[PDB]
Write a protein that binds this ligand. Structure first.
Ligand code: NI
Lengths: 347, 370
């Protein structure tokens, strides 16, 4: 019953090295489209000048050709976006076109030459974006001054260091065909630079509270649980405390974001968690059931499956290990993180 | 027992099964005089029933009074984990009916104010949509009936005056949902089953006021409306949506290219009203004649037409990816268009001669400027 369903999902889920990159594969029989996602390890936090977002714009260009125009003529919409630690290149298409579209995409991503006219043109485009969540977007876009201090040598060096197969994760969701090196020879287009070390530079009106007590998967469970618990208590008591989440694939720990003005009310609610002894145990039981229900519902949408692969590293981990981590969260884990949150809020 | 089992094979295999019932309210939704009452009671019923039915293995319960081509329909839906993958079997359709009839009247009264405020806010936010308000004000005047535009989600004055004595119309609504004849849809095992052959006869309102000018004075946008004559199912469901993407959506659309000479453009085909709208944010006076002359002298070519076919197929494929988009498609479409494969094949078989038939049947009907 429940065990056979997790086994069903896991037999369609796989991850293997292809060339010098890794491809996470979730096959769906008779899906109408296939989602392909190329995720490069560089975002707004890897370099705080907006360089990653600048590179994302440059990556659409190769020898005067724009890959969005090439994909559009092939009937596919290429979408790109930069988050705090990654840059995503995502598109949907029929499975017969996946191999050629993917290899054409990696052809652009592993191109490392950008003339001055292309750099200056994209700078003007990005400055118009800066002049046109809000703190997160402007941090990714950078400022007009910060991107104006980077030239061709920097962008090309950054491309060679970060846009490599070793620093790339590929996710292909839907269909039934396997991804291999013969069809994507660009998966070996390497440079002299290996995978960059996970340097982060998390840079004053908010506080960042760590959720770190257990394995990588456990931290996501606890972080979602405590954030959901605090929001529920803030509703009944009609507070106005927003609780943001910092959950990144390259971070072993998870983090809660709360306004520094709302620190007092949030601190009170954290201490309010351990009041009702049955509240934590019943909310964990409700969350475990809700998590499984949402996963069953979400595993029909290609993009939602992709979000599980990036948040929970599904592929490296099985769905069995995901639910095993979920089922292992007890009230003692919550109380332990409750204590470390209170210690962080004290100082 | 069902009279038929219309099994459509080749469907995407989903993680859940779906059991849906579509009950026909044959009269056009403007002819229903208790429209605001029926909407409010249905949402109240849905909320109460959901609390009792949305337990394992049921993941989501759906009950709405929906409009499909200007005809009211009660649509009951059940999303659930398949029995082979669920620790508990799903209730039958008879037990779901029994849950609806076992709804307590005090439970409905507990939801009255919340449901009333929910629907009131939907009426306001749908009316308070500027770019669509131009389309709303046009549809109001083009059809001489506010039920097609402003009062489409219900009239505000009628909905805001509902009191809790609407509880006494709950037996009539429960009877209509449980005992009214309808079609059953069942998605399972990569197939969708339909209980009977029946095509919902479409209704499109006729334009009464032709050539509407919404001269509106306000301080800090334009909207033009077009229609088509002799509309076939192929046009309303495939060709015209392709035409809308051709002229105001698919990348370098005809309107973006035309209006970039002047130097925030949108277009949408309303299948309910058979109206193609074009919304664009002093300078609007030149854009008015520039848009009109562009649609009058519209031309096509087979290379760009083949790309619009590919794009619209992939957009339809993306809707079929969603189990609700698939279900809604199989409910609404006529005959063989219910089969997604047949619908996709019908897109692939369109030819450019179809666009010139559509251009000859196209005309302007209204314009709204704020
Ligand atoms: Ni951008």
């Amino acid at each position: 019953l429940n065990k056979s369903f997790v086994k069903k999902l896991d037999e369609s889920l796989n991850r293997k090295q292809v060339g010098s990159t890794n491809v996470t594969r979730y096959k769906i029989e008779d899906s109408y489209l296939v989602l392909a996602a190329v995720r490069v390890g560089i975002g707004g936090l890897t370099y705080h000048n907006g360089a990653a977002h600048f590179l994302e714009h440059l990556k659409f260009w190769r020898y005067g050709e724009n890959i969005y125009n090439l994909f559009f003529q092939r009937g596919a919409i290429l979408n790109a976006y930069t988050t705090l630690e990654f840059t995503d290149y995502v598109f949907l298409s029929k499975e017969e076109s996946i191999n050629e579209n993917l290899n054409l995409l990696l052809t652009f991503l592993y191109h490392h030459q950008y003339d001055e006219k292309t750099i200056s043109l994209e700078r003007n485009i990005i400055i118009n974006e800066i002049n046109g969540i809000e703190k997160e977007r402007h941090c990714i876009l950078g400022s007009a001054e910060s991107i104006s201090r980077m030239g061709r040598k920097e962008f090309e060096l950054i491309s060679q260091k970060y846009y490599t197969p070793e620093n790339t994760s590929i996710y292909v969701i839907g269909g039934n065909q396997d991804i291999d090196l013969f069809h994507i020879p660009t998966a070996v287009m390497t440079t002299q630079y290996g995978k960059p070390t996970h340097k982060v530079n998390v840079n004053k009106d908010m506080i960042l509270l760590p959720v770190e007590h257990g394995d990588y998967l456990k931290n996501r469970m606890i972080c979602h649980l405590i954030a959901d618990m605090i929001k529920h208590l803030a509703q009944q008591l009609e507070y106005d405390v927003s609780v943001g989440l910092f959950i990144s694939t390259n971070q072993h720990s998870c983090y809660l974001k709360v306004k520094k003005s709302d620190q007092k009310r949030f601190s009170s609610l954290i201490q309010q968690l351990s009041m009702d002894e049955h509240f934590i145990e019943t909310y964990i039981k409700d969350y475990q059931w809700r998590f499984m229900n949402e996963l069953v519902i979400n595993f029909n949408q290609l993009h939602n499956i992709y979000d599980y692969m990036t948040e929970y590293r599904l592929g490296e981990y099985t769905v069995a290990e995901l639910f095993g981590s979920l089922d292992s969260v007890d009230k003692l884990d919550i109380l332990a993180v409750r204590n470390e949150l209170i210690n962080q809020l004290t100082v | 027992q069902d009279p038929m089992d219309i099994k459509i094979n080749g469907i995407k295999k989903y993680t859940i099964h779906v059991l849906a019932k579509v009950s026909a309210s044959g009269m056009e939704f403007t002819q229903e005089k208790d429209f605001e009452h029926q909407l409010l009671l249905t949402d109240m019923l849905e909320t109460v029933i959901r609390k009792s039915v949305e337990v394992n293995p049921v993941l989501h319960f759906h009950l709405r009074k929906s409009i499909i081509m200007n005809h009211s329909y009660f649509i009951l839906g059940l999303n659930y984990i398949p029995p082979a993958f669920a620790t508990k079997n799903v209730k039958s359709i008879h037990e779901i009916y029994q849950a609806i009839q076992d709804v307590n009247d005090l439970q409905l009264l507990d939801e009255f104010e919340k449901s009333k405020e929910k629907l009131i806010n939907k009426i306001q936010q749908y009316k308070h949509s500027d770019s669509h308000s131009g389309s709303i004000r046009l549809k109001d005047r083009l059809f001489a009936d506010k039920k097609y535009g402003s009062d489409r989600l219900g009239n505000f004055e009628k909905m805001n005056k509902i009191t809790d004595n609407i509880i006494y119309a709950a037996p009539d609504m429960v009877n209509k949902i449980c005992e009214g004849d309808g079609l059953f849809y069942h998605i399972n095992d990569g197939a969708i089953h339909i209980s009977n052959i029946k095509d919902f006869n479409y209704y499109i309102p006729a334009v009464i006021n032709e050539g509407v000018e919404d001269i509106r004075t306000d301080f800090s946008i334009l909207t033009c409306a077009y229609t088509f004559e002799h509309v076939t199912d192929l046009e309303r469901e495939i060709l015209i949506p392709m035409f809308d993407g051709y002229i105001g959506k698919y990348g370098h659309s005809v309107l973006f290219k035309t209006l970039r000479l002047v130097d925030h453009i949108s277009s949408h085909y309303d299948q309910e009203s058979n109206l193609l709208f074009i919304t664009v944010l002093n300078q609007l006076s030149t854009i008015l004649t520039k848009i009109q002359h562009t649609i009058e002298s519209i031309e096509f070519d087979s290379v760009s037409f083949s790309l619009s076919k590919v794009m619209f197929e992939n957009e339809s494929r993306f809707r079929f990816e969603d189990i609700n988009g698939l279900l809604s498609h199989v409910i609404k479409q006529h005959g063989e268009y219910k089969n997604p494969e047949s619908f996709l094949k019908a897109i692939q078989n369109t030819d450019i001669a179809d666009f010139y038939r559509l251009k000859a049947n196209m005309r302007w009907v209204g314009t709204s400027i704020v």
